[PDB]
Amino acid sequence: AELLSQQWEAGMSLLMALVVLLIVAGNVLVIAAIGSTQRLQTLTNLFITSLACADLVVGLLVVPFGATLVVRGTWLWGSFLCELWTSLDVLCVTASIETLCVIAIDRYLAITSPFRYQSLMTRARAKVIICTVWAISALVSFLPIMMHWWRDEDPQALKCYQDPGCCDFVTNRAYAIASSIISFYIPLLIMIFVALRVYREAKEQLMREHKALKTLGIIMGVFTLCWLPFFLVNIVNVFNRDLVPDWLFVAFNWLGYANSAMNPIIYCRSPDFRKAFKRLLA
Ligand SMILES: CC(C)(Cc1c[nH]c2ccccc12)NC[C@H](O)COc1ccccc1C#N
């Protein structure tokens, strides 16, 4: 049994270290590629940078802390770090779906109203948009957690709050529903609605302007596939606590984490990223 534990720890630790490396390496490349290639320095890629930072924070902070919990079965970092960790987790997935939502609107307005778009949409303004996305994401994610709005009345929950080794996100039903709707479900619907409109307006309307759009359609689709299972379960868990097994919930949350390693791979469809990747890996 002690050998089974010693194998499981060292085994998992490496899988986790591989995941961390794939996320951090992949996204640092994307930030560097854009940051040092003036062919890639478009307004749209400013939003891709923002998105890569969100995925970077997942790789440097969210998954590391999450790994120590999955390896060692308990939280080792004190109740304050548990809260700050959870806040960063919630923050990143919120900022990601909001930025993807901006990207869809960006592409739409650029397609349907190209004269008015290109005369209004500036670098200064894309930065303002990006900050506003992060400001809103911070507001919706950080505050309710620090205010303990998520916490429930149950004695078993109360037991977990006092124990600085418990870092389970046992949330009340109101928070579970509200935070899911505000952080995920609303921006997801807006994104899908706008993305379908773009897909329609693309056919009605030029190889390089397209294909890049398809790429953006992929990242949005993949994100949805990685996160929808988690948020669906999260809502089901409110109506009946026992239907979904613990492992399936934890697994789906890890699928969502995994999404942070996927974009840099998907960007390799764009040859200019591919060339910038090859140059940087000197
Ligand atoms: C914080 C938690 C539950 C990870 C976690 C932390 N401790 C746990 C113990 C057992 C299972 C999972 C966990 N997962 C957060 C997910 O990344 C998604 O988080 C969210 C993002 C926006 C709105 C609501 C949620 C939630 N819940």
Author numbering: 33 to 237, 282 to 358
Relevant lines from the article:
The avian β1AR was modified to allow crystallization by the removal of flexible regions at the N terminus, C terminus, and in cytoplasmic loop 3, and the introduction of 8 point mutations (see Experimental Procedures), to give the construct β1AR44-m23. Six of the point mutations result in thermostabilization of β1AR (Serrano-Vega et al., 2008), which allows crystallization in short-chain detergents (Warne et al., 2008). A consequence of thermostabilization is that the receptor is preferentially in the antagonist-bound state (R) (Serrano-Vega et al., 2008), although β1AR-m23 is capable of binding agonists with a similar rank order of potency to the wild-type receptor and can couple efficiently to G proteins (Baker et al., 2011).
We have determined the crystal structures of a thermostabilized avian β1AR mutant bound to bucindolol and to carvedilol at 3.2 and 2.3 Å resolution, respectively. With the human β1AR, bucindolol has been found to act as a partial agonist of the G protein-signaling pathway as well as an agonist of the mitogen-activated protein kinase (MAPK) pathway through a G protein-independent mechanism (Galandrin et al., 2008). The cocrystal structures show that their secondary amine and β-hydroxyl groups form potential hydrogen bonds with Asp1213.32 and Asn3297.39 and their “head groups” (equivalent to the catechol moiety in adrenaline) occupy a position adjacent to H5. Comparison of the structures of β1AR bound to bucindolol and carvedilol with the previously determined structures shows that the rotamer configuration of Ser2155.46 allows the formation of an interhelical hydrogen bond with H3, as seen in the structures with bound partial agonists, but not with bound full agonists where Ser2155.46 forms a hydrogen bond directly to the ligand.
